[PDB]
Recover the amino acids of this structure.
């Protein structure tokens, strides 16, 4: 199974940036996906989560207006659309897989 | 090009009556019950939703020494029996019987249930019985009838598919043998191969195959040997609506609903299966105990019994009542009832009485003809001047010693005498 | 002024039998289920409540090289096929099937509920299934049939209407394509456009359009190309009475009730929607597997298949039974049942066998004629001596290689031989 983040760089404050994630080895359209970032102080925080179909998304209040998680089930890809970022959002962004569609979103990220 | 039998099989005025005595079979309605013997005094599976396929063997009309040499000459003509009349007798009274399962996969009542809602975690399997769909059918031929059913088809490609995925469904034609299970309202499929649960349908069929006659294939037959007489009459409705427990293999598309406030909520089970029911059984809709006269067949074979045999497929679910016999466990019962002091047994009964009117026929073995018969079945000429059907299980009916020319001595014979 | 085709199209004794083999389709009964490939090994939406629209392509009788030049001369006469007999074959056994929704908008039982009353605050949506209205229909033409349905009509005037108001309802006619949804007991409308709830009707139709054949418009057609043979047979009844949650857009007039002592009482939900039901399915009410002979059509076009094509719309909900296939998630099941160790799939199956008897006809291309044909369809003369219907989805049935003059070789051919 492979979850590969990609995209795109280190960018100016107040500007946009799109993050991609390619999945392999499992039915991507069957699982709910999530973004988890690790601050430079090495603390892990939950960033976003999207349903198996790209219809249901939810975030913390700290990122409610800036970030937009999306997914392409035909391409087996996960996206995080960040915009007007501040310096406090500096982090190592991780692409994680949660529970499948036939389970309540139990919120543990195995992969 | 296949040719109608009315062009190369001339008929005579010689008519015979043939009939079995009363045929009956008792057994268990749900499954074969083995009892260690003295092998074996077991009771067989005798269900009202079973195909009854009688293999009726007729006496060789060429070897028959009753007709005189005025009817035919054994130089260019040969004899063959032609079926004209059929009456299928049914014995037991009309009744409705149940088939069930103690661990039926019933999750939630979806037919306006305000009682409660069941949790999927624990073993949510209820003890459920049901009265099956009502079916009366009758097919007469000289070749076993062809039925269709869905089975676990072979792998689509040389492709490794994940365990738990839905297997491919393949429609399959098979000869209908005596004892096969009929469509009961859950479809015509291989429940043993397509349901590893062993809990979706009652015990009658949970490990069996339900076959439905392929009327489309038998009617499009070239020669029409499979079926030259067919009577169907079936009815069913949905009595109760239920839910199936188990993880949904097909993801419910999120375009078709709105999840509500709990945006991380698992959608409830959306695999709905109704309980079938055959509604009222009435003698007005009865289809047997009646004489049926075959004049024109549906196919080109017009009721000609090649190889002096005749296959009769019949299903009658209008007598599905089940006898409940119970015996006390004490030698004599103490006059106090406790369920532990009584053994309960379920037995089912089937009773038939087959009657036939056959017509003797000549076949002038010309050229063009006979070569046509050779292209039809070489074994026809071979038997005149092994068995491929012994691989299948039939109910044997030997009528070689049961033919009689005194038609007025038998009920079907008299009813046939009202046809001059 | 339009003229009957029996006045300028002379008929011949040349008859042909044409028939497709067995047609079958399996899939999901409620929705298309995409599976990521290797695009695509997905299962399609195969519902018993779907329109089956076959586009039967016929061989060009002028290009036909089997009849001799004695039947007609290609100097002032041209040939066209005319349909005479039709038999629609249905394969699977009769059954009733359910369609449901896990989040169905069911507030309170409004029939005779003494259980309790539900609170409106939370998500008061129950898991509800239902057996749809029973519908059998058949329409034969040379142009796809015309159906009607209700849609969200365009704004009445250049008027800004408030969000949440009831949109105007507009009746719309559209050609009936293969796969369209039939009326199921909730009406013939665009549920996707008129119900933002996505929770008023089952998953079968909650995001689809239910179309009903516009018999009034097709029968009032000038030429009668849309429908020259029509058989309908539908039945339905109200099984359960329910209430719909959601704020009432129409204010209940205070002239129609008395509020009681609590002069603050919110009027209960007064939008009542019943659960339809198709009652018993019986083979006595069956409408297919029978030969139908077209002599006089309803319109002026008397079964003439212009452009050598024939459109057959058919709906049969009497075989709506659903196969339930489940596969274990463990490679082999440990002999212990838990709902998490079985994947459940619902598959549906449709089987047809179309049969036709066509008659060869002549058209002497006089003046008055041909000019009448030109005013009818210029493309008729143009094709004699592109296509607007490929924008629609049909089930293609190619019978150019299946025409045969040996009528006695086919069942419908023999049944037609009982017509001399």
């Amino acid at each position: 199974v492979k979850l590969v983040e990609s995209g795109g760089g280190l960018v100016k404050p107040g500007g946009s940036l799109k993050l991609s994630c390619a999945a392999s080895g499992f039915p991507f359209s069957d699982y709910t996906m999530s973004w988890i970032r690790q601050t430079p102080e090495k603390r892990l925080e939950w960033v976003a989560s999207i349903s198996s179909g790209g219809t249901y998304t939810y975030y913390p209040d700290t990122v409610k207006g800036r970030f937009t998680i999306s997914r392409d089930n035909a391409k087996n890809t996960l996206y995080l659309q960040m915009s007007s970022l501040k310096s406090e959002d500096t982090a190592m962004f991780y692409c994680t897989r949660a529970s499948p569609y036939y389970d309540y979103d139990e919120g543990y990220m195995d992969y | 090009k296949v040719v109608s039998t009315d062009e190369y099989v001339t008929r005579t005025s010689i008519f015979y009556h043939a009939g079995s005595s009363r045929l009956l079979t008792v057994g268990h309605p749900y499954f074969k019950v083995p009892k260690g013997g003295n092998g074996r005094q077991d009771v067989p599976k005798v269900s009202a939703y079973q195909y009854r396929v009688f293999r009726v063997k007729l006496p060789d009309p060429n070897k028959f020494g009753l007709p005189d040499n005025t009817v035919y000459d054994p130089n260019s003509q040969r004899l063959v029996w032609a079926c004209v009349g059929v009456e299928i007798g049914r014995g037991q009274p009309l009744g409705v019987g149940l088939s069930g399962h103690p661990l039926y996969n019933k999750l939630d009542d979806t037919e306006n249930s305000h009682v409660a809602s069941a949790v999927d975690t624990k073993d949510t399997r209820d003890n459920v019985s049901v009265d099956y769909k009502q079916t009366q059918l009758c097919i007469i031929g000289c070749v076993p009838a062809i039925g269709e059913h869905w089975t676990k088809g072979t792998a689509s490609k040389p492709t490794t598919v994940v365990q738990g995925d839905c297997p491919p469904l393949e429609l399959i034609n098979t000869p209908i043998e005596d004892g096969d299970m009929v469509d009961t309202g859950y479809g015509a499929m291989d429940f043993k191969l397509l349901q590893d649960n062993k809990s979706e349908v009652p015990l009658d069929i949970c490990q069996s195959i339900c076959k439905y006659p392929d009327y489309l294939q038998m009617s499009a037959d070239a020669y029409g040997d499979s079926m030259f007489f067919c009577l169907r009459r079936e009815q069913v409705f949905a009595r109760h609506f239920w839910n199936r427990s188990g993880t949904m293999g097909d993801q419910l598309p999120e375009s078709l609903y709105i999840k509500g406030t709990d945006i991380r909520a698992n959608p409830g089970s959306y695999l709905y299966s109704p309980s079938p029911s055959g509604s009222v059984v009435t003698s007005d809709s009865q289809l047997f105990n009646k004489p049926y006269w075959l004049h024109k067949a549906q196919g080109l074979n017009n009721g000609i019994c090649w190889h002096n045999q005749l296959f009769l497929t019949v299903v009658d679910t209008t007598r599905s009542t089940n006898l409940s016999v119970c015996a006390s466990t004490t030698s004599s019962i103490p006059n106090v009832y406790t369920p532990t002091s009584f053994k309960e047994y379920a037995r089912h009964v089937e009773e038939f009485d087959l009657q036939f009117i056959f017509q003797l026929c000549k076949i002038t073995l010309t050229t063009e003809v006979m070569s046509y018969i050779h292209n039809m079945n070489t074994t026809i000429l071979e038997d005149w001047n092994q068995d491929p059907y012994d691989k299948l299980k039939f109910w044997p009916v030997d009528l070689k010693e049961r033919f009689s020319a005194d038609l007025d001595q038998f009920p079907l014979g008299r009813k046939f005498l009202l046809q001059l």
Remarks:
- The domain at 1-420 of chain B is CATH 2.60.175.20 (Polyomavirus Vp1; Chain A).
- Chain B touches chain C through 89 residues (CB under 8 Å).
- Chain B has one domain: 1-420.
- The first strand of chain B starts at residue 10 and ends at 19.
